[PDB]
Design a protein around this ligand. Structure first.
Ligand SMILES: [Au+]
Ligand SMILES: [Au+]
Ligand SMILES: [Au+]
Ligand SMILES: [Au+]
Ligand SMILES: [Au+]
Ligand SMILES: [Au+]
Ligand SMILES: [Cl-]
Ligand SMILES: [Cl-]
Ligand SMILES: [Cl-]
Ligand SMILES: [Cl-]
Ligand SMILES: [Cl-]
Ligand SMILES: [Cl-]
Ligand SMILES: [Cl-]
Ligand SMILES: [Cl-]
Ligand SMILES: [Cl-]
Ligand SMILES: [Cl-]
Ligand SMILES: [Cl-]
Ligand SMILES: [Cl-]
Lengths: 172, 172, 172, 172, 172, 172
């Protein structure tokens, strides 16, 4: 094993690889979400953009984890990437609900990894998560909750109109 | 026939002239759409602008086809231009539905011309269409589908309010 | 009829639509003229350019009339566009003679419309014509007469040489 | 199926999704290659950089395919992502040999997709591949062949020295 | 054969080499044309320049074909270059007639190569021709036809005068 | 013969034409050398570049000779261009040896032409050679000898490694 590796458990190494799979799976989900909102029969450009930007953010999260794995002397191992949970995503409301579920699963994986780092006394790992992931996730989940509340307020009234207005005046 | 003309069938030449007629007819339709939304009793400025810009795009499409006809040594022939299918265009929803129908007819004419070019082994024609028309049309039709979905979401609720909001927050 | 419409007769409205047809027909004629001078067996680039620029000017004239129709609360109605009077345009002299005939027909239509506006006491219409069309047409017809005189002086001598020289030293 | 979808076969749609999987698998392989060359006991920074930049290029290829899938009205479907073929990559020579094998498999998939597009008369697909993938792949494979020849010339002599020199004077 | 070569037939490879010979032969012809118009007893500087610039364009065409041959893994093979068809080129009219004959032979060779690429399902080759040669040739042939018409118009009248005027007012 | 021609022998005229053939033949050889080093199975980019730049230099030499031929009132005559002496060029060492042989043949042709100019008392010719060719050739041959010595020093040791290092650290 590495000439560089120091205080880096095989348990963290493996969990890191699993987290990479989760983030790339999340990126794939957002790719599918984005392109669904680009369909001529859905056509909510601002929604498409919001998800496509998240696909990039999650890929970037994976890359950051991969770089860290090499910095610590672990070995990146890639697994098959499951396709997204749906082929069609319903309304903006349905899609944002699915996004916040996804982000909470990522968040919980991050927290689990942190707890493992703390159990293994791996402060570099803890700092890495604290510095590049935990706050970003909190911020993102908050934003999603904000959106959900606004989408919900709009679409009790008259649903199509509310969906359009949200896209035009919050997302675009 | 031309000193320049090479691999340019009489069938493509004629189809090009017909496509010019279709694009100018489309430009005329958008001129009528634009000015209908400028009526004091319709008064949706952002809708007027969206259609007036399309009238310009379609005229520009025609000109591009005419320039190409001369570059290949074909002879532009102009025919009468039929007036638009309607004198009044209803709501923003009605108008966008009519626009996407129109654009799909243009798209199908483009695809037909491409197939003719491919049957005649005219790769300059194919490239010309691929480069200046097929993607533009795809993009435009997608945008229209996006708009339609947003208009529809807005105007199940309460129709006038939705029509106003769309114009103000997506189009203007 | 319009919430905006005021002092705008149905007779002017209809004449405006007819003038739009005439200007678009003129634009089509100039498109054909331009591309004829681009043939490898005609090959007078400066002549091609002079006509292609006029096609744009006439389309722009039509658009200006269409915008005005909507500003006054009239309804644009488009008709078939007749093809140009010729498929081949002869010499630069022949082509300029045909252009000045065309421009005089446009001019006379403009004057007729003005007289109708004056009979209907429609000073907005009169001003619109006076401001954006009557002087432009006068200027253009003068320029064409200038060209014709110079073309004619050149091509009594030795015709091909004169045609080349005009293109090179006046048009290009 | 889509309001936008036109001339886009289910066979191409599916092949596109498969190509996305291949490009993301390639990106994963390059992530593993990059981090292997960052190990303290391998320590060839210029090699690490060369592979890490390729991981980004392949992810970007996938994204471009996903964007195109949505533009055509197809539906992105993601599958599990297999881990890379090796956990340790040997020498720079071994690694470059594995890279060129990988790139040739991507190239052949691209060519297969093109042939399918050509069989389905899908010129947008053909152009998309021709414009954004086929030449890039050719260029890349050439570069890899160049590197391989230079690596091989260096490491018949005295292997460690050659590996160092290549990294320092070609890659860094 | 090449480590890079993929979908590149021996028939295209050979035809490419032949096209290189044709373009370099064309460059040589234009070199001779240029210098003939520089003779003290011909002395038409603008004609000399027009041909000398074409010699450069054709050499550049050859180089572009050679670069492409290497990119595809073909092997450039050079053959003897035949001298130009004439040692003296007559008038500007004679010379432009010879130029357009030459350009049409190049054009037909380009079209033949395209057809071969299409028969071999070599879309990189087709795109290469479409993108860097077919339109350039069309444009050039059109320009030559334009010149020929202007030269001919000038020199029915009084030949020396027309030849001078063309050089001074179109070419210089 | 020319209105301009003065003190320019038919012997020099003919030798100039022959030198043009030699320089274009040299340019062709360098085109083949360049593209050989671009093969995926040779892959020495810096070597490819060094030869491709020489192909341009030799074409430029030919053009300079052609311009001079016209300035003196001679008549450019082009002959077939023989293909290069090899289809594959071996190692960088083999290729540089072939290049210096070629350059010495060009140099000797230049010297022969100078001697002919001196025998014919043609000081314009002598100056032309002295000013634009003899020193360039000396400089180039010296550079090649420098390269050869460095290539040879590198590839007694361990040949592949030396070939790579030379390309990376001298050529690239
Ligand atoms: Au910790
Ligand atoms: Au085609
Ligand atoms: Au009036
Ligand atoms: Au195709
Ligand atoms: Au093809
Ligand atoms: Au001398
Ligand atoms: Cl451990
Ligand atoms: Cl799974
Ligand atoms: Cl035909
Ligand atoms: Cl009709
Ligand atoms: Cl009235
Ligand atoms: Cl009519
Ligand atoms: Cl299908
Ligand atoms: Cl697998
Ligand atoms: Cl073959
Ligand atoms: Cl021959
Ligand atoms: Cl002599
Ligand atoms: Cl020989």
């Amino acid at each position: 094993s590495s000439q560089i590796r120091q205080n880096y458990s095989t348990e963290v190494e493996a969990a890191v690889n699993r987290l990479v799979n989760l983030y790339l799976r999340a990126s794939y989900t957002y790719l599918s979400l984005g392109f669904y909102f680009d369909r001529d029969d859905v056509a909510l450009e601002g929604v498409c953009h919001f998800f496509r930007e998240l696909a990039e953010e999650k890929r970037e999260g994976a890359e950051r984890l991969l770089k860290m794995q090499n910095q610590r002397g672990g070995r990146a191992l890639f697994q098959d990437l499951q396709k997204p949970s749906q082929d069609e995503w319903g309304t903006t409301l349905d899609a944002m609900k699915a996004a916040i579920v996804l982000e909470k699963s990522l968040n919980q994986a991050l927290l689990d990894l942190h707890a493992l780092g703390s159990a293994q006394a791996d402060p570099h790992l803890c700092d890495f998560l604290e510095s590049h992931f935990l706050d970003e996730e909190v911020k993102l989940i908050k934003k999603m909750g904000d959106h959900l509340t606004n989408i919900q307020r709009l679409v009790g009234s008259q649903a199509g109109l509310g969906e359009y207005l949200f896209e035009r005046l919050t997302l675009k």
